[PDB]
Amino acid sequence: NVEYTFTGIYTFESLIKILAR
């Protein structure tokens, strides 16, 4: 978590969705 906080969560949320569909 550097700059993208909120969105970072959501963006990364998509990621997590990948490894855990």
mmCIF file with all atom_site columns, N, CA and C in Angstrom:
data_model
loop_
_atom_site.group_PDB
_atom_site.id
_atom_site.type_symbol
_atom_site.label_atom_id
_atom_site.label_alt_id
_atom_site.label_comp_id
_atom_site.label_asym_id
_atom_site.label_entity_id
_atom_site.label_seq_id
_atom_site.pdbx_PDB_ins_code
_atom_site.Cartn_x
_atom_site.Cartn_y
_atom_site.Cartn_z
_atom_site.occupancy
_atom_site.B_iso_or_equiv
_atom_site.pdbx_formal_charge
_atom_site.auth_seq_id
_atom_site.auth_comp_id
_atom_site.auth_asym_id
_atom_site.auth_atom_id
_atom_site.pdbx_PDB_model_num
ATOM 1  N N  . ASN A 1 1  ? 0.840   -1.226  0.000  1.00 0.00 ? 1  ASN A N  1
ATOM 2  C CA . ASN A 1 1  ? 0.000   0.000   0.000  1.00 0.00 ? 1  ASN A CA 1
ATOM 3  C C  . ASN A 1 1  ? 0.862   1.258   0.000  1.00 0.00 ? 1  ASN A C  1
ATOM 4  N N  . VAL A 1 2  ? 1.100   1.805   -1.187 1.00 0.00 ? 2  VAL A N  1
ATOM 5  C CA . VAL A 1 2  ? 1.910   3.008   -1.326 1.00 0.00 ? 2  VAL A CA 1
ATOM 6  C C  . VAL A 1 2  ? 1.036   4.244   -1.504 1.00 0.00 ? 2  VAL A C  1
ATOM 7  N N  . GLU A 1 3  ? 0.396   4.341   -2.662 1.00 0.00 ? 3  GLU A N  1
ATOM 8  C CA . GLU A 1 3  ? -0.471  5.475   -2.964 1.00 0.00 ? 3  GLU A CA 1
ATOM 9  C C  . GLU A 1 3  ? -1.922  5.033   -3.108 1.00 0.00 ? 3  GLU A C  1
ATOM 10 N N  . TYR A 1 4  ? -2.138  3.998   -3.912 1.00 0.00 ? 4  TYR A N  1
ATOM 11 C CA . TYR A 1 4  ? -3.477  3.473   -4.143 1.00 0.00 ? 4  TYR A CA 1
ATOM 12 C C  . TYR A 1 4  ? -3.981  2.704   -2.924 1.00 0.00 ? 4  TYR A C  1
ATOM 13 N N  . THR A 1 5  ? -4.782  3.369   -2.100 1.00 0.00 ? 5  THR A N  1
ATOM 14 C CA . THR A 1 5  ? -5.331  2.750   -0.902 1.00 0.00 ? 5  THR A CA 1
ATOM 15 C C  . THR A 1 5  ? -6.670  2.082   -1.200 1.00 0.00 ? 5  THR A C  1
ATOM 16 N N  . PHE A 1 6  ? -7.730  2.881   -1.210 1.00 0.00 ? 6  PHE A N  1
ATOM 17 C CA . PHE A 1 6  ? -9.073  2.377   -1.482 1.00 0.00 ? 6  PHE A CA 1
ATOM 18 C C  . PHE A 1 6  ? -9.090  1.507   -2.734 1.00 0.00 ? 6  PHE A C  1
ATOM 19 N N  . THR A 1 7  ? -8.847  2.135   -3.876 1.00 0.00 ? 7  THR A N  1
ATOM 20 C CA . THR A 1 7  ? -8.834  1.427   -5.141 1.00 0.00 ? 7  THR A CA 1
ATOM 21 C C  . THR A 1 7  ? -7.877  0.243   -5.079 1.00 0.00 ? 7  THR A C  1
ATOM 22 N N  . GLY A 1 8  ? -6.751  0.432   -4.396 1.00 0.00 ? 8  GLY A N  1
ATOM 23 C CA . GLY A 1 8  ? -5.782  -0.641  -4.262 1.00 0.00 ? 8  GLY A CA 1
ATOM 24 C C  . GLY A 1 8  ? -6.425  -1.898  -3.717 1.00 0.00 ? 8  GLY A C  1
ATOM 25 N N  . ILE A 1 9  ? -7.334  -1.714  -2.771 1.00 0.00 ? 9  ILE A N  1
ATOM 26 C CA . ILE A 1 9  ? -8.058  -2.822  -2.165 1.00 0.00 ? 9  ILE A CA 1
ATOM 27 C C  . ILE A 1 9  ? -8.924  -3.508  -3.216 1.00 0.00 ? 9  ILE A C  1
ATOM 28 N N  . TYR A 1 10 ? -9.637  -2.693  -3.974 1.00 0.00 ? 10 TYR A N  1
ATOM 29 C CA . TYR A 1 10 ? -10.533 -3.184  -5.010 1.00 0.00 ? 10 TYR A CA 1
ATOM 30 C C  . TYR A 1 10 ? -9.775  -3.820  -6.170 1.00 0.00 ? 10 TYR A C  1
ATOM 31 N N  . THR A 1 11 ? -8.696  -3.181  -6.583 1.00 0.00 ? 11 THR A N  1
ATOM 32 C CA . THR A 1 11 ? -7.875  -3.702  -7.668 1.00 0.00 ? 11 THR A CA 1
ATOM 33 C C  . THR A 1 11 ? -7.336  -5.068  -7.261 1.00 0.00 ? 11 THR A C  1
ATOM 34 N N  . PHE A 1 12 ? -6.706  -5.072  -6.101 1.00 0.00 ? 12 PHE A N  1
ATOM 35 C CA . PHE A 1 12 ? -6.144  -6.271  -5.530 1.00 0.00 ? 12 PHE A CA 1
ATOM 36 C C  . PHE A 1 12 ? -7.251  -7.277  -5.264 1.00 0.00 ? 12 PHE A C  1
ATOM 37 N N  . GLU A 1 13 ? -8.452  -6.772  -5.003 1.00 0.00 ? 13 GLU A N  1
ATOM 38 C CA . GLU A 1 13 ? -9.588  -7.650  -4.755 1.00 0.00 ? 13 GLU A CA 1
ATOM 39 C C  . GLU A 1 13 ? -9.847  -8.496  -5.991 1.00 0.00 ? 13 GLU A C  1
ATOM 40 N N  . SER A 1 14 ? -9.682  -7.885  -7.162 1.00 0.00 ? 14 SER A N  1
ATOM 41 C CA . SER A 1 14 ? -9.863  -8.599  -8.415 1.00 0.00 ? 14 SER A CA 1
ATOM 42 C C  . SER A 1 14 ? -8.787  -9.666  -8.527 1.00 0.00 ? 14 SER A C  1
ATOM 43 N N  . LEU A 1 15 ? -7.569  -9.295  -8.138 1.00 0.00 ? 15 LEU A N  1
ATOM 44 C CA . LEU A 1 15 ? -6.445  -10.219 -8.150 1.00 0.00 ? 15 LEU A CA 1
ATOM 45 C C  . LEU A 1 15 ? -6.801  -11.454 -7.340 1.00 0.00 ? 15 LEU A C  1
ATOM 46 N N  . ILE A 1 16 ? -7.085  -11.235 -6.057 1.00 0.00 ? 16 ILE A N  1
ATOM 47 C CA . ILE A 1 16 ? -7.465  -12.312 -5.154 1.00 0.00 ? 16 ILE A CA 1
ATOM 48 C C  . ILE A 1 16 ? -8.547  -13.187 -5.775 1.00 0.00 ? 16 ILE A C  1
ATOM 49 N N  . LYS A 1 17 ? -9.426  -12.553 -6.545 1.00 0.00 ? 17 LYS A N  1
ATOM 50 C CA . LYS A 1 17 ? -10.502 -13.260 -7.220 1.00 0.00 ? 17 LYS A CA 1
ATOM 51 C C  . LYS A 1 17 ? -9.924  -14.231 -8.244 1.00 0.00 ? 17 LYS A C  1
ATOM 52 N N  . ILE A 1 18 ? -8.797  -13.845 -8.835 1.00 0.00 ? 18 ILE A N  1
ATOM 53 C CA . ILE A 1 18 ? -8.124  -14.679 -9.821 1.00 0.00 ? 18 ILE A CA 1
ATOM 54 C C  . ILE A 1 18 ? -7.608  -15.956 -9.174 1.00 0.00 ? 18 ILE A C  1
ATOM 55 N N  . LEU A 1 19 ? -6.747  -15.792 -8.173 1.00 0.00 ? 19 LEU A N  1
ATOM 56 C CA . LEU A 1 19 ? -6.174  -16.929 -7.467 1.00 0.00 ? 19 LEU A CA 1
ATOM 57 C C  . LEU A 1 19 ? -7.238  -17.686 -6.668 1.00 0.00 ? 19 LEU A C  1
ATOM 58 N N  . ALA A 1 20 ? -8.373  -17.036 -6.415 1.00 0.00 ? 20 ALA A N  1
ATOM 59 C CA . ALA A 1 20 ? -9.456  -17.659 -5.664 1.00 0.00 ? 20 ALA A CA 1
ATOM 60 C C  . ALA A 1 20 ? -10.813 -17.336 -6.281 1.00 0.00 ? 20 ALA A C  1
ATOM 61 N N  . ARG A 1 21 ? -11.081 -17.908 -7.450 1.00 0.00 ? 21 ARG A N  1
ATOM 62 C CA . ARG A 1 21 ? -12.345 -17.677 -8.139 1.00 0.00 ? 21 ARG A CA 1
ATOM 63 C C  . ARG A 1 21 ? -13.496 -18.360 -7.408 1.00 0.00 ? 21 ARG A C  1
#
